[PDB]
Structures are given as C-alpha cells and as structure tokens.
C-alpha cells in the first residue's frame, strides 16, 4: 500500500484496458471516491454511477445533468431525465415551451400529445399531498386542452387542404364537440371561425339547415379572414334557399334517459334533461351509448373486478354487489387511473356495438375504428404507444 506510483500505474492501465471494476477496487483500496465517480461517468457505467449517486446524494447532479443534457441534444428523453432528477417544475416548463412552439407552428396533433404528457406529469406530481388539489385542477385543464387540440387538428387539416380525409359526420361531430367544450377564453391557436365554417358547411351537406343558419349568424359576430369571406357570404345566401328544419338522424339521443337533445346545447357536453355527460369516440366523435357509474361505499376496486369476473349463470348511478354480479365483463369498461384518482366504471347500453378503450390513455373508441387506427399507425392515435403496452 506504500507503493503509490506502481499502484496508480496499475489503476490507470486497468482504466486504459476498459476494466473499470478492478480500477475501481484499486481506487477504493486507495480511498479515492472522486476518481471512482469520474471513472464510472467516463466508462458510461450509468447503473453503477446511479448506485453511487443513491449511496452519496452529493453526486446526483454530476451524473443526471450530463445525462439529461445528452438526452435533450439527442426533448422527450430530456423530460424523462428532469423527471428522474426530481425537478418536476423544470420538466413541466420545458414541455410547456414545446407545446407553445407546436401550437405556434400549427402542429396541433403534437400539441395534443404534449398536453396529454403534461397532464400525466401533473397527475404524478399530485401524489404529493401539499399540491394535490391545484395539480388535479391543472390535470383536468391539460387533459381538456389535449382533447381540444386533437379535435381541432382535423378541422384545421380540412380548412387548409383542398380535400377531406375525414367523413362529413366526423367533422360535424368534432365541430359540435369543440363549440360545446370551448371556454369564453379561446385557447391559443384555436379558431372559432374555422370550427363554425366547417360546422356550417357540413351542416348544409348533412341537412341540418337551422344549425347551419345559426353557425352563419355566429360567424357574423367574429372577425372573418379575407380568404373565407366570399365562401361564407355565398353560404349565407345559399342557406336562405333551404328549408327551416334539421335532419332527425343527426339529433343526439341521451342513452341514459332516452331524451333527444338540441344539436347545440348551452350546458357544455351534457344532456339537457338528466345532465349525464356525453362520452365521445376519440376517432369519430359520435356519442358512445356508455353511461358512467359509481361503486357503492365499502366495495374496493379489486373486489368490484372479482364480482364482474364471477358471472353467475346531476344524480350519479350507484351500483351494488348483486348488480355487479349480474353485469357481463363485455358491457363494463374500466379506467385504471394512477393513485389519487379512483377507478372510473362505464356501462355500454348496446352490447352489439363493440367499444374498445386504449389501455394506456384510457380514451374510448368504436372497436373496429380503434383496431383499424392501431393497425394503420402501429400505435394508439392519441398516445402513440404500441399494443405491446398494457400500462396506464
């Protein structure tokens, strides 16, 4: 142990010969933790560096800042690295900048994905009791923004392209969903003029001529860009020649109370009678024959699943043990949110019309549409995860 020059020459040759475990044993015999951490960072042994950073917290910044920067230069990896650093506020700020840039660039589908990621981060932060209520409010806010930008992207594409990929009924439904969901303060980059113009055009094509007149009258209260003006004037002169009725086939039935609801409701996204919230297909935005329900007090979510699996041969709907036993697993859909949120249960009232949910983002779809969209894109259209992931 007195032969420091020979021992350091052995340690430096063991480093030069890519043998960091025996170089490390030699540095540990000499007592040198500073050379040990540099040896693990330089040999890129991140698992051993992280193990030393967990044993000695003073090195966490020296390991994870180089790693997060390298991941950012090669932003999604930067965010995962800010998350692993415990600096949740900076992770959110970087993602908020990227969302604002995506909106400014008219990349509304990427903005929707980043707003969903911001929502999931807020839910992870809400696990701390001191920020639960505020971060749950931000979670619902960013979840709503993710859905608004996901809908608006289809409308924007229709208005900027000389053709539509989307069906007229899909664009009609999306336009109605957006007008119901838009606050008094329109979120940045979203256009009410574009949404009302697509609603007016598709309402004319589908035979909803009172709704088309209403959309043109609402357009007259807004500043209209010069490129749309001729089309909106011609449309306003054209709709005056059409009858003053709307097609009965377009009218949203509430599946809970069997009430027919007006094509636009001033109460946002609910039935005018029972105030049940409408649940919409994340592909087509059709209302889904689902009703949300709640467990009776003293049933656990694990117990509720076991009762649903054991098949025997505004006012909320509350369900008892004996009703859960009578229900088929095909008819019940379950959203398995992370902890300070309880699991949410939904019943299909039309078992023949198969509904599917993404196991990761918990969005709901017609099964044939979800199967098709997943097979086309290799992933969920909303969260970009492959079918290989069953996790939230």
């Amino acid at each position: 142990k007195a032969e420091r020059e020979p021992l350091l020459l052995c340690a430096t040759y063991l480093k030069k010969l890519d043998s960091p475990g025996y170089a490390a044993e030699t540095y540990l015999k000499m007592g040198d933790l500073k050379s040990l951490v540099q040896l693990h960072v330089e040999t890129q042994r991140w698992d051993e560096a992280f193990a030393l950073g967990e044993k000695h917290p003073e090195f966490k910044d020296d390991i994870y800042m180089p790693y997060a920067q390298w991941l950012a230069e090669n932003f999604e990896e930067a965010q995962k690295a800010f998350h692993k650093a415990g600096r949740q506020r900076e992770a959110v700020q970087v993602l908020e900048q990227l969302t604002n840039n995506a909106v400014a660039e008219s990349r509304f589908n990427d903005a929707a994905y980043y707003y969903w990621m911001l929502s999931m981060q807020c839910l992870d932060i809400a696990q701390d009791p001191a920020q639960k209520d505020t971060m749950l409010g931000k979670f619902y806010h960013f979840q709503r923004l993710a859905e608004l930008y996901h809908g608006y992207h289809a409308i924007h594409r229709h208005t900027e392209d000389p053709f539509s990929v989307h069906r007229p009924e899909t664009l009609f439904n999306i336009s109605r969903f957006l007008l119901h969901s838009l606050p008094k303060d329109t979120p940045s980059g979203i256009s009410k003029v574009k949404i009302l113009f697509t609603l007016a055009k598709q309402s004319k094509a589908l035979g909803a001529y009172r709704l088309a007149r209403h959309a043109y009258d609402k357009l007259r209260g807004l500043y209209i860009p010069a490129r749309f003006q001729k089309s909106i004037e011609l449309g306003t002169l054209t709709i005056r020649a059409k009858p003053f009725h709307d097609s009965e086939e377009l009218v949203p039935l509430c599946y809970r109370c069997s009430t027919n609801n007006p094509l636009l409701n001033n109460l946002g996204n609910v039935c005018i009678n029972c105030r049940q919230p409408f649940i919409f297909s994340a592909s087509s935005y059709d209302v889904l024959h689902l009703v949300e329900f709640y467990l009776e007090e003293g049933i656990t979510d694990e117990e509720a699943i076991s009762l649903i699996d054991l098949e025997v041969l505004f006012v909320p709907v509350v369900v008892s043990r004996l009703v859960l036993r009578s229900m088929s697993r095909r008819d019940v859909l379950i959203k398995r949110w992370p902890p300070p949120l309880r699991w949410q249960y939904f019943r299909s009232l039309l078992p023949d019309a198969s509904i599917t949910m993404c196991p990761s983002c918990f969005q709901m779809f017609h099964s044939e549409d979800y199967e098709l969209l997943v097979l086309q894109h290799g992933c969920c259209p909303y969260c970009r995860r492959c079918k290989d992931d069953p996790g939230p």
């Binding site: 697993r329 099964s367 044939e368 199967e371 097979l375």
Partner: protein, 125 residues
C-alpha cells in the same frame, strides 16, 4: 358475405375477435377452435360458452376453459360430461394458489379412481 376469405384475412390481420364473431355467426366450429386457441383468454371463454350453448362439442368447451385458466368451470363441465382424461390434465395444473374446495373435490375423484398418490398431493395443496 364471403365467410372463408373474411376469416382468412382477419386471421392474417391477427384480429381473432372478429374472426371468432364471424365463425360463431356461420357455424365454423373447427376454425373457431383454432382461432380461440391463438386468441386472448377472454376470447377462449367466449368460444367455450358458444360450444356450451350448442352442446355438441363439450370437450372443446372444457379445453378452452382449461387453457383460459378457469379451472372451476372446466372441472364442473368435465364432471357433467364424465370426461376422465380432461379431469386428469386439469388436476395436473392445480397448484397451492387454487381454491381448497376444488382441490378437495378432485382428491375425492382420485380416491374413487384408486390414484392415491395424486389424491394426497391435492389434499396437501
């Protein structure tokens, strides 16, 4: 309505649920079995219920409930149909995580058929 080609292309698309639905509506029981065995345990249970509702192929119902891991309903059907070979295969897969009442019923069956060593292992479980 070209069923055989629709089933072929659904199977190639790995969309076993649609192929199962289509096989059920047209009575393609042999393709239904092969598709169910490739699919999820829930689709195996649904194909097992279809074979129960027909009544003709009650061995396929036992096999699909067995391969879905629903040992209770597989044993009940295997007792009701007197299928001794299927009971022996189900019993070989009953571990200490299985219900004590099912293990006791299986042990009484092996006591009645002189297989005392297996009856002891199930009584211990």
């Amino acid at each position: 309505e070209e069923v055989g080609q629709a089933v072929h292309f659904y199977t190639r698309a790995q969309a076993f649920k649609n192929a199962i639905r289509l096989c059920k509506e047209n009575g393609l029981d042999d393709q239904l079995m092969n598709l169910a065995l490739l699919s999820s345990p829930e689709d195996m249970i649904e194909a097992a219920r279809y074979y129960e509702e027909k009544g003709v192929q009650m061995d396929r119902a036992v096999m699909l409930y067995h391969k879905a891991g629903h040992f209770s309903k597989a044993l009940e059907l295997a007792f009701a149909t007197q299928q001794f070979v299927a009971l022996q295969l189900i019993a070989e897969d009953l571990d200490e995580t299985s219900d004590p009442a099912l293990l006791a019923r299986c042990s009484d069956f092996f006591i009645e058929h002189s297989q005392y060593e297996r009856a002891v292992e199930l009584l211990l479980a």
